[model samples]
Each structure stands twice: as structure tokens, then as C-alpha cells.
Target: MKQKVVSIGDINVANDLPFVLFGGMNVLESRDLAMRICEHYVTVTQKLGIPYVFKASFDKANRSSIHSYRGPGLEEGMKIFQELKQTFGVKIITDVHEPSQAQPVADVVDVIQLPAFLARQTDLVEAMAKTGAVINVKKPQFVSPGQMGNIVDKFKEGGNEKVILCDRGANFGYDNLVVDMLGFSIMKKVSGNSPVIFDVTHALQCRRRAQVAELARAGMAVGLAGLFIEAHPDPEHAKCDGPSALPLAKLEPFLKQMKAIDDLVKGFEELDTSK
Candidate 1:
């Protein structure tokens, strides 16, 4: 299969290329903290030679309750993102919640994310597509991998074929999630080999955070275009998704392992399993 290499400036992401690390904090908890985290990621990815794109959410949108830390809204968030660009000169990615936010956020960030819960929201998708920025569509845990093809098609119909499909995990039970290792390939097969990525940390919300390395390696073993994860300086106290987040101290070793896995897999000649 000919995999589409989704380009973010100079970074070319495809199943056949060395994987990019879409790694960072879960949300822009604070400008100082976001700065600190991005700095760490930049230093590490540079040393490891992994293409990196800093990922975070400006607004978390639907938090489980009425009062989760929603993040530094749009304006403040973009301001910080701009600073991150100026400071480290790194590419950036963040989540967007509403139709109104699409253009403004797209104008600044290298990529705009479609929150999994709103993955099928027609208007939001249309708005995001109109920007023509690369859109990362989170595969809703409730939706099957096959259904992801439809979402990609929606982006194409909206006139933006620059899309990446992300599989965080699937809703296994009440308040729990489980990653279907097979889902990654299913998504690639479904989308004619669209860049299918694994959101490793989010996939663990359902931690076996003790098993973050194991789970992440598993995703890379499947030959992903990229690996998405959240790393907090203090996972125990991260403002959001701390339970599933990797500790900031472990960032280097963790990514070293992921980079190794990615390199080893991408080095192999394609096997003719179908034949």
C-alpha cells in the first residue's frame, strides 16, 4: 500500500518513515509549565533524532464533570504556542472544540485536532477542513475502526485531504478504555493507508502508567506513522489525565525506546503476508 506522507513543514510522516513523536503535556496548564515541558521534549527529541511536534489542548472541551481545568482558553493558549514557536522553533499541535475556533487556531498552529467526542460533528469538521491545515481526527472510542474511513472521507469531502487518523483506545466498559492493537492496522487499511497514529497515553486511561513503555512499544511494533503521548513533570499531580501520563523525568528514556522501536520497524523490508 502507498502510505500518504503527511508533511508538517520539513517533517514527513508516513508508516514507512521514521515516526514522529507528537509528545507534550495534556493541556496548557500554565504558560511556564507548558514552556518547561516543551523544552524538555525538544531537548530529548533532538538528541534522539526523532521528528517532534509539541501537542497540547487549548481547551479540553468536554471534561467528565462541570469543573475540570479547561486550559488557558484560545487567546492565551495561542500566545503561549506562538512563544513556544519563537523560543524552540518547534512545530505545534493542539485540540480545538468549536466551529468558531477552527480558523483562528489553524492560522497559528501547525495542526488542529478534532476532539474524539466531536469527531463526527459535521459543522466542526467542515470548519476545520476549510482551514486546510492538517487535521488529526481522534477515533472516537465508541466508533469502530472501520467507521474511521467515513470521518476521513468527510474531511476529503470538505476539501481537506490532509488528515491523520489517531486511535487513542476504545471504550471497554464504564469509565475504562482498552487499545485494540489490531485497530491501528484496520484504520490504515480503511483509509487507504492514511497516516495512522497511536495515542499511547490516552489509550491507557482505561495504568498499567507502569506499563506505559510496554504499551507504547506495542504500538510502535505495529509500525505507526507517529506515536502520541502526554508527559508531565509530575504525573501524580498533572492537572489533567495524570493517571495515564508519563512522568517528565522518564521522557528521555521512554522516547529513546520508542525511537528505537520505530527505527527497527521502519528498517525491515515489507513482507508479503497477503501472498
Candidate 2:
């Protein structure tokens, strides 16, 4: 079957559709705070008429600081996500840090996303695929875009097919990143039309690496599935991922620009030399 980003339940994404993602929870907060933030995220998306995918991390295993806050543990975190699904009527996306968490987390969450850091974790990817949920594989920050095909093969070997490739950005100078637009097309071909998504906010993240607006525009031009961004009610004061998260208010204008660019590029079909 042709793959596209659609909600398995309430979670929605696309292979070629443009979209926005709430940041995977970075700030360790009570379930109430987490759910409230998710609520606002859904409301904001509804207002913008943009496809929304709720993303929050139950654990921050990749945090730079050992003392940084992690999420509510699996038991409580899953409960938080379950309620959020019922209350808001939107799709939920959370990362699986370890291979073991995949089964239990997939049972509750609509989509199981593999962290960019874990992109090469064959065991984790396969574990996520077995749940029969939509699996979004983030392109690692270190690897070239063309190399994502190997990641796709990992899932195929696991006997799973429904997958999405996410382009976060490529490592540039130390502690900096650059989005190569060619990766979008290259990754799509590598995945064989399996939906590809560009992670906007995470790509721009200064904490992991520095990104500029031009890199985002470059990725958006690749014309794959939708886009991913971490938006908060306030990016500046966001509990986690403040450096890269876009403010909730900026979603509309940002999406409009992306869509406009998509429309422009989409109008041009590749010349058919065979014709």
C-alpha cells in the first residue's frame, strides 16, 4: 500500500503533507502540566487549521546534563498520554528510548517515534515496528541524508513496513547543523516513497547544534510528507527545548510560508525524458 502520513487513531502525519509537532517533552513536569501543555498544543493547531501531531518524551535519556529533568516514568507517563488522547481527540507521539519500552508504549501511543539518537539502534527500531504502530525514524544528526536507506532496511528485516523518515539536519561545524534539501528527495527515494518528514524545530535546535531559518526553508523545499516542529505556548520560557522550539503563535505564519513554497515547487513536474 502507498504510505502517507495519516492518523492511526488521532495522530496525523504525511509522507508529503506539511505538519507541525509539539516538542517531545523536555521539561520534567507533573502529568497535569504535561497534559495541559498538550491541550494548548492541540488547541493552537485547531486554530491554525494545520495538521497536528502531539509529541512529548516520557524520558530524556539523551539530555546533555545528567541533572536535567526527565519525564514522568513509563507507568505514569503512559497514563498521562492515554488521558490526553481521550480529552483532546488528537494523535500522540512519544519516543522509545530503549527496546523494552516499545511494546508497552506502542499499546497506548498512536505513533511510536524512534529518537534521532537511536536511529541506528536496530533492536529499538524492530521492537517499535512489532507493535504494528506507525514508526517514524528520525534521521540521525551525524549521518548524511543519503544513508537513511540503511535505517529503512532495519525495519524491513523486522517484518514491519509502515515507517516514516524524519530529516532533522546534518552535522556541519562542531555544534552546528545544516539541512541539505537534496536529502529530502534522496531520503524519499531511499525509503521508496515511505513517508519522509522534516523535523523543523529539532533541526534548528541550538542545544544539539545551531540551525538557521534558511536550512528549514531548504528542507521544506524537498516536498515530502509534512514538517515537524516543537512548538510551545512560549518557546522562550518553555520548560524544555526552549532554544529550538517555535512559539505556539508562530505556527500559522510559518505553515503558510511552508505551504506556499510547497505549492510553488509541486507545480513543476520532473521532465519526462522517456516521453
Deviation from native of the Cα of residue 150 in model 1, angstroms: 0.6
lDDT of 1 by residue, 157-263 (tens): 99998899999999887988989998988899889789999998888885248989999999999899999989888778777776778889899989888888888
Clashing pairs in 1: 177-206, 208-211
Error of 2 at 60 (Å): 0.5
Specify the highest-lDDT model's number: 1
RMSD (Cα, Å) of candidate 2? 3.3
lDDT of 2 by residue, 160-275 (tens): 77787888878888877777777776787767766778887777755332343455567667665676666556556655576676655565666667767766765567655667
lDDT of each: 0.90, 0.71
Instruction: Provide backbone clash counts, one per model.
Output: 2, 12
> For candidate 1, what is the lDDT?
0.90
